Amino acid sequence: TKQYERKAKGGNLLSAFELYQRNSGEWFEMCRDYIQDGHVDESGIFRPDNAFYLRRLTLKDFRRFSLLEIKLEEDLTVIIGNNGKGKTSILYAIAKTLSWFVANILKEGGSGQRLSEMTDIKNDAEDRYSDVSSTFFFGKGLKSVPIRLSRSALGTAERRDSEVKPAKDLADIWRVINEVNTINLPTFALYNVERSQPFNRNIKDNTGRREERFDAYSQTLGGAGRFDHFVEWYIYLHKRTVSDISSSIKELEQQVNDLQRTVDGGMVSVKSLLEQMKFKLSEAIERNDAAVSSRVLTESVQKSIVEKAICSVVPSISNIWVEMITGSDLVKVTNDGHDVTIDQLSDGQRVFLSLVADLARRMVMLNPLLENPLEGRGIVLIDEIELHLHPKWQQEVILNLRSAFPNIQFIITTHSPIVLSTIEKRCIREFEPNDDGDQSFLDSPDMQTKGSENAQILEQVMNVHSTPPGIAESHWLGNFELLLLDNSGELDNHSQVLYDQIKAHFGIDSIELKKADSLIRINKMKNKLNKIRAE
Amino acid sequence: RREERFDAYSQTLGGAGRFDHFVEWYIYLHKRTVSSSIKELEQQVNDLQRTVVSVKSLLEQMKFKLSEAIERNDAAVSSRVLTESVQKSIVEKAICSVVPSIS
Amino acid sequence: MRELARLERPEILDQYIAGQNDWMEIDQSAVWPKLTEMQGGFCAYCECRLNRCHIEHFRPRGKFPALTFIWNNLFGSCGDSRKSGGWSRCGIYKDNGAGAYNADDLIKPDEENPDDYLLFLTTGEVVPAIGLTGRALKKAQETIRVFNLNGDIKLFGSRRTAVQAIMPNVEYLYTLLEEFDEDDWNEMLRDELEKIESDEYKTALKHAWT
Ligand SMILES: Nc1ncnc2c1ncn2[C@@H]1O[C@H](COP(=O)(O)OP(=O)(O)O)[C@@H](O)[C@H]1O
Ligand SMILES: [Zn+2]
């Protein structure tokens, strides 16, 4: 109608799409441009004009939470807290909501994942239902996409229905526009602690489902990724890069031509073989055309992008390649300067490799039209980012991830002060230590964490003392100071004994002893001042 | 899920009469029937909660009884059911009456 | 690093001659007491307390076999290859870790004063001193690089920790400039600088006090 036309011309995406659906060119192009338009930043990074991110989350009577409201950052949000505070619960809630987008991108009227009646309802909920309410943002044209997942407990006084239509409507736009003309699609992924798992060497190259674009959405929100799928896909890419398809077509074309000449020469016995070869040729051309038709990055380029991503983000890995050892295809890595198999990698290296490889695979598959497919949009959830990482790696992990995937919204959980030392306080959401499940609003810490000392973060943010309280020696310097202050700054028999104990235990060049020495010197000087003033 | 009256029609015309289902069901009924106004029960639960270490087991049993009473109260007229203790007794009698050499 | 007062040549270096003799032959317990007199049980290059230690040739024995039993070339460095591998500063790093270097553009602490070239910031870094250009800058920058005086985290961490421990005492003394007269205050600063001869990382502690 005229009203929809006005709103659509005003930049409203839903109105433009509704006009497209009713008339089924201009409206299609508007929708496509809304999704596809962007610019390259001063840093050379592609930036979509219309960003997609989760803005807000509300939990009512969900697991431990009676009521919780969270505002999320467009780029990076880190959730911190003690064990059992519900950090994982928050990520799971988001993942279930995202499942509704994924389901409807794949299939019209596809159903996402529902809340569990057994586990997701708070144990002492008076209303005996749970709600997960989420609000998404998609550019100025679609400032609010509200979604609610609801589940009622078993005793069932009244049914509370989920409200998922907005998710479906938006996902429909992606699906339908993509069907007509290929567009870049958002990546959704959850990496929970289940990402840590043993590598099966037995690479069952299935048939060829791993080459399909929407295999990128297969098991995206399952928590583990599919590192096996990566390996299969990567070997596939390698085999195709070593063998050009057009030469095979040219060779097949030549074979078909030679066989046709033989059939024309009176050898009717080879007619069956000619028909088979013509079929093979047609299939090869179709694959080539489909590849051509899909406007897709060449297999060589895809391989290179992923390899670069892995080597950039994973510090111990300088190179990754496919060997043809004996018969079977093996993925090899240069790890700490040595060529090894994936099964020879440490668990920490493998787990992190798996995360990055999986994510890169999905991004390459979902963003074929971008010069750099890793500059695509999406929302990625990572539980316990520091899982298996040495402190040195914890200092680099967030920087490396954000550099490699500049337009992904990362929502992460951590226990690591070292990780927090690399992040701005605005990105941090902390639970209060004494939270008995009634804290309405997660909040930013008071201290700036980025560039701060680890010891300060431990004390001021994580509420942990710099020295272990259950060790007697942890108290000695404090006690020594108290003794000095009690005896007007003079080193008495008791202070001397403790000093000697500190010296004996920690050593002559220990920090503790130097601090003790400092205390003696300052107290002596203070006393000298006091005497001069008294006289 | 709990039991409900029309589960009696589930797999009635193929898949009925499987030993394992019986044993599981029977043990379940036994556990529930080992060891009554809602307001009175609510009052008893409240009194027991105020007392609460040795009475904790009794409190949990009474909370279960209260929940069951509320559920029965909340449950619809169409899905009216005999107590688990009665159900157990009837099945035991049926088995002992019908099955050769089981007393 | 400190400016070191080299004094007298020990008697055992008279006997052994370059070409014929090797450093494996000479006794090392003969040489130490004069270096311990020179340096004061502290490293020549970083000023840690010596415990694991070795006699270091400033110009190495491979490249310069002339300067093998010469008293000016010898220094007490920290670290000891014989006991435990993987030491990453001073004598051991100059050989192994630091790649190519010109030996001429390094601070030899017996000859030159380090204080003109090096500055010790209380945040823990060693840097070139304010206003060096060309050649003097190159010596300062290469002494820092070749002895790994920042790049060793153990050293950097130990040095920062020590300076940061005394910075209450530095701020408190300079407040009492006003109330005290000059003879009282100059006696106090003399007394604090008296202590730090016996202390680890003395040049870094000096720059904090003065
Ligand atoms: N249905 C529920 N009702 C009440 N509390 C629950 C429920 N499910 C889990 N919890 C509480 O939630 C905590 C687990 O939350 P979780 O997200 O795993 O914490 P973490 O921040 O350590 O990942 C447990 O300590 C438990 O008491
Ligand atoms: Zn040294």
PDB file of C-alpha atoms in Angstrom, chain A residues 302-408:
ATOM      1  CA  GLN A 302      39.558 -20.658   0.021  1.00  0.00           C
ATOM      2  CA  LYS A 303      42.393 -22.942   1.061  1.00  0.00           C
ATOM      3  CA  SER A 304      44.812 -20.023   1.345  1.00  0.00           C
ATOM      4  CA  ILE A 305      42.423 -17.900   3.455  1.00  0.00           C
ATOM      5  CA  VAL A 306      41.839 -20.629   5.979  1.00  0.00           C
ATOM      6  CA  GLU A 307      45.544 -21.526   6.185  1.00  0.00           C
ATOM      7  CA  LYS A 308      46.443 -17.899   6.818  1.00  0.00           C
ATOM      8  CA  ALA A 309      43.738 -17.582   9.476  1.00  0.00           C
ATOM      9  CA  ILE A 310      44.943 -20.661  11.334  1.00  0.00           C
ATOM     10  CA  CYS A 311      48.600 -19.660  11.201  1.00  0.00           C
ATOM     11  CA  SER A 312      47.806 -16.092  12.311  1.00  0.00           C
ATOM     12  CA  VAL A 313      45.585 -16.992  15.245  1.00  0.00           C
ATOM     13  CA  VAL A 314      47.303 -20.172  16.507  1.00  0.00           C
ATOM     14  CA  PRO A 315      50.825 -19.183  17.758  1.00  0.00           C
ATOM     15  CA  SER A 316      52.520 -22.611  17.650  1.00  0.00           C
ATOM     16  CA  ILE A 317      51.359 -23.343  14.064  1.00  0.00           C
ATOM     17  CA  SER A 318      53.409 -21.821  11.226  1.00  0.00           C
ATOM     18  CA  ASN A 319      52.149 -24.045   8.404  1.00  0.00           C
ATOM     19  CA  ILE A 320      49.357 -26.516   7.566  1.00  0.00           C
ATOM     20  CA  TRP A 321      49.173 -28.749   4.471  1.00  0.00           C
ATOM     21  CA  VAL A 322      47.862 -32.052   3.052  1.00  0.00           C
ATOM     22  CA  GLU A 323      50.285 -34.911   2.421  1.00  0.00           C
ATOM     23  CA  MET A 324      49.605 -38.084   0.407  1.00  0.00           C
ATOM     24  CA  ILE A 325      51.301 -40.490   2.876  1.00  0.00           C
ATOM     25  CA  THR A 326      51.256 -44.177   1.740  1.00  0.00           C
ATOM     26  CA  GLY A 327      47.650 -44.270   0.315  1.00  0.00           C
ATOM     27  CA  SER A 328      45.566 -42.046   2.590  1.00  0.00           C
ATOM     28  CA  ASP A 329      45.393 -38.217   2.766  1.00  0.00           C
ATOM     29  CA  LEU A 330      46.867 -36.762   5.968  1.00  0.00           C
ATOM     30  CA  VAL A 331      46.731 -33.176   7.252  1.00  0.00           C
ATOM     31  CA  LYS A 332      50.115 -32.068   8.591  1.00  0.00           C
ATOM     32  CA  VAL A 333      51.155 -29.021  10.548  1.00  0.00           C
ATOM     33  CA  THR A 334      54.430 -27.300  11.371  1.00  0.00           C
ATOM     34  CA  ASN A 335      54.098 -27.037  15.159  1.00  0.00           C
ATOM     35  CA  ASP A 336      56.882 -25.327  17.122  1.00  0.00           C
ATOM     36  CA  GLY A 337      59.172 -25.734  14.062  1.00  0.00           C
ATOM     37  CA  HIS A 338      58.475 -29.501  13.668  1.00  0.00           C
ATOM     38  CA  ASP A 339      56.264 -31.229  11.071  1.00  0.00           C
ATOM     39  CA  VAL A 340      53.681 -33.374  12.883  1.00  0.00           C
ATOM     40  CA  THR A 341      50.221 -34.868  12.353  1.00  0.00           C
ATOM     41  CA  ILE A 342      47.122 -33.335  13.968  1.00  0.00           C
ATOM     42  CA  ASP A 343      47.004 -36.329  16.345  1.00  0.00           C
ATOM     43  CA  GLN A 344      50.469 -35.417  17.585  1.00  0.00           C
ATOM     44  CA  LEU A 345      49.372 -31.910  18.666  1.00  0.00           C
ATOM     45  CA  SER A 346      48.916 -31.136  22.352  1.00  0.00           C
ATOM     46  CA  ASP A 347      45.307 -30.959  23.605  1.00  0.00           C
ATOM     47  CA  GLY A 348      45.551 -27.184  24.078  1.00  0.00           C
ATOM     48  CA  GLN A 349      46.824 -26.647  20.525  1.00  0.00           C
ATOM     49  CA  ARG A 350      44.306 -28.997  19.001  1.00  0.00           C
ATOM     50  CA  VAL A 351      41.329 -27.473  20.818  1.00  0.00           C
ATOM     51  CA  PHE A 352      42.229 -23.968  19.770  1.00  0.00           C
ATOM     52  CA  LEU A 353      43.082 -25.032  16.201  1.00  0.00           C
ATOM     53  CA  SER A 354      39.691 -26.759  16.058  1.00  0.00           C
ATOM     54  CA  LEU A 355      37.820 -23.619  17.108  1.00  0.00           C
ATOM     55  CA  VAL A 356      39.526 -21.326  14.615  1.00  0.00           C
ATOM     56  CA  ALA A 357      39.487 -23.815  11.740  1.00  0.00           C
ATOM     57  CA  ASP A 358      35.795 -24.549  12.192  1.00  0.00           C
ATOM     58  CA  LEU A 359      34.879 -20.876  12.418  1.00  0.00           C
ATOM     59  CA  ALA A 360      36.974 -19.993   9.363  1.00  0.00           C
ATOM     60  CA  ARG A 361      35.418 -22.826   7.349  1.00  0.00           C
ATOM     61  CA  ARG A 362      31.931 -21.573   8.125  1.00  0.00           C
ATOM     62  CA  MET A 363      32.775 -17.973   7.314  1.00  0.00           C
ATOM     63  CA  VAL A 364      34.352 -18.870   3.952  1.00  0.00           C
ATOM     64  CA  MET A 365      31.264 -20.894   3.053  1.00  0.00           C
ATOM     65  CA  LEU A 366      28.752 -18.203   4.108  1.00  0.00           C
ATOM     66  CA  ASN A 367      30.520 -15.133   2.688  1.00  0.00           C
ATOM     67  CA  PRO A 368      31.470 -15.985  -0.934  1.00  0.00           C
ATOM     68  CA  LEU A 369      30.998 -12.412  -2.226  1.00  0.00           C
ATOM     69  CA  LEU A 370      33.464 -10.780   0.165  1.00  0.00           C
ATOM     70  CA  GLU A 371      37.085 -10.219  -0.842  1.00  0.00           C
ATOM     71  CA  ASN A 372      37.917 -11.370   2.701  1.00  0.00           C
ATOM     72  CA  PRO A 373      35.173 -13.812   3.790  1.00  0.00           C
ATOM     73  CA  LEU A 374      36.354 -13.579   7.424  1.00  0.00           C
ATOM     74  CA  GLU A 375      35.058  -9.955   7.440  1.00  0.00           C
ATOM     75  CA  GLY A 376      31.485 -11.362   7.366  1.00  0.00           C
ATOM     76  CA  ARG A 377      28.823 -10.734  10.020  1.00  0.00           C
ATOM     77  CA  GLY A 378      27.771 -13.046  12.819  1.00  0.00           C
ATOM     78  CA  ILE A 379      27.427 -13.863  16.505  1.00  0.00           C
ATOM     79  CA  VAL A 380      29.896 -16.270  18.126  1.00  0.00           C
ATOM     80  CA  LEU A 381      29.593 -17.566  21.702  1.00  0.00           C
ATOM     81  CA  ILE A 382      32.689 -18.962  23.448  1.00  0.00           C
ATOM     82  CA  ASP A 383      32.644 -20.533  26.873  1.00  0.00           C
ATOM     83  CA  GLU A 384      35.885 -20.496  28.935  1.00  0.00           C
ATOM     84  CA  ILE A 385      38.072 -18.911  26.222  1.00  0.00           C
ATOM     85  CA  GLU A 386      41.232 -19.649  28.294  1.00  0.00           C
ATOM     86  CA  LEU A 387      40.474 -23.443  28.186  1.00  0.00           C
ATOM     87  CA  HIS A 388      43.866 -25.292  28.116  1.00  0.00           C
ATOM     88  CA  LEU A 389      45.871 -22.107  27.298  1.00  0.00           C
ATOM     89  CA  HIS A 390      49.173 -21.182  28.926  1.00  0.00           C
ATOM     90  CA  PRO A 391      49.316 -17.565  30.370  1.00  0.00           C
ATOM     91  CA  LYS A 392      51.437 -16.439  27.426  1.00  0.00           C
ATOM     92  CA  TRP A 393      48.668 -17.442  24.989  1.00  0.00           C
ATOM     93  CA  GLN A 394      45.981 -15.924  27.188  1.00  0.00           C
ATOM     94  CA  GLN A 395      47.720 -12.545  26.632  1.00  0.00           C
ATOM     95  CA  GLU A 396      47.256 -12.843  22.829  1.00  0.00           C
ATOM     96  CA  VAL A 397      44.022 -14.810  22.251  1.00  0.00           C
ATOM     97  CA  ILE A 398      41.429 -11.937  22.236  1.00  0.00           C
ATOM     98  CA  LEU A 399      43.651  -9.704  20.093  1.00  0.00           C
ATOM     99  CA  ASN A 400      44.225 -12.475  17.542  1.00  0.00           C
ATOM    100  CA  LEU A 401      40.553 -13.464  17.338  1.00  0.00           C
ATOM    101  CA  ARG A 402      39.295  -9.900  16.916  1.00  0.00           C
ATOM    102  CA  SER A 403      41.937  -9.175  14.284  1.00  0.00           C
ATOM    103  CA  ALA A 404      40.986 -12.255  12.238  1.00  0.00           C
ATOM    104  CA  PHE A 405      37.177 -11.815  12.598  1.00  0.00           C
ATOM    105  CA  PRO A 406      36.580  -8.019  12.783  1.00  0.00           C
ATOM    106  CA  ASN A 407      32.760  -7.950  12.299  1.00  0.00           C
ATOM    107  CA  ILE A 408      31.795 -10.922  14.574  1.00  0.00           C
TER     108      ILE A 408
END
